[PDB]
Structure 1
């Protein structure tokens, strides 16, 4: 049993809810919140901008030190950093950004990072300002992630379309 509340069950291991991932993280304080990161960990907008703002820019400060030491992530890759006031840990995962021409096949590799964590609160990778089709992202999620994932979808219209179109 866990504290995630009000989710629709899509599969054995994937759950979904119309929710602001920032508000959901503050309320549950999950072991892992996933950030929709880029390779430079520049958390300017979208989910990343929102999570970073909620940490009062502490996420960005930590991220800048990470990059200065380690260099950029790979598209499809991830790193574990602090969850600050939102979670124990933040898993920064880089999905391909279609508005940069990145290969959408890398979306499966991106979701594979979730399998290293038993339970996660997460957004749909490559959705929103990353330009991919969220219906496709949900399908890849369900077909790739085997651990327990609680997806937060900010837009109510999109959430309903995601639920109503789910096979």
Structure 2
């Protein structure tokens, strides 16, 4: 049994809810919240900008030190950093950004990072300002992630379309 409330069950291991991931993280304090990161961990906008704002920029400060030591992530890759006030850990995952021309096949590799964590609160990778089709992102999630994932979808309209169209 876990703390997550109000989710619709899509499969054995994937759950979805219309929710602000920031507000959900604040309520649940999950072991892992996933960030929709870029390779530079520059948390300017979208999910990343919202998570970082909710940490009062402490996520960005920590991220800048990570990059200064390790260099950029790979598209499809991830790193584990602090969850600050939102979660125990933040898994920063880089999905491909279609608005930069990145290979959508890298979306599966991105979701494979989730399998290193038994339970996660996450957004749909490569959705929103990363430019991918969220319906596609949800299909890749279901077909790739085997651990228990609780997906937060900010937009109510999109949430209802994801559920209604789910095979």
TM range (shorter): over 0.9
Q: Give 1:46 deviation, angstroms.
A: 0.1
Q: Give 1:70 deviation, angstroms.
A: 0.1
Q: Give 1:82 deviation, angstroms.
A: 0.0
**Residue 56 of structure 1 aligns to a residue in which SS?**
coil
Query: What per-residue deviation string (whole Å, max 9, x for no partner) do you get for residues 92-146 of structure 1?
Result: 0000000000000000000000000000000000000000000000000000000
1:6-155 equivalences under 5 Å are 6-155=6-155
Work out the CA distance in 2 between the residues paired with 1:166 and 1:129: 22
**Residue 74 of structure 1 aligns to a residue in which SS?**
coil
Query: What per-residue deviation string (whole Å, max 9, x for no partner) do you get for residues 132-162 of structure 1?
Result: 0000000000000000000000000000000
Runs of 4+ in 1 over 3 A off after TM superposition: none
- TM-score of the superposed pair, with normalisation by structure 2: 1.00
**Residue 2 of structure 2 aligns to a residue in which SS?**
coil
Work out the CA distance in 2 between the residues paired with 1:133 and 1:105: 13
Structure 2 stretches lacking a partner, 5+ long: none
Count of aligned pairs between the two proteins: 167
Structure 1 stretches lacking a partner, 5+ long: none
Query: What per-residue deviation string (whole Å, max 9, x for no partner) do you get for residues 24-81 of structure 1?
Result: 0000000000000000000000000000000000000000000000000000000000
**Residue 115 of structure 1 aligns to a residue in which SS?**
helix
Name the Cα RMSD after superposition.
Answer: 0.1
Work out the CA distance in 1 between the residues paired with 2:96 and 2:3: 31
**Residue 92 of structure 1 aligns to a residue in which SS?**
strand
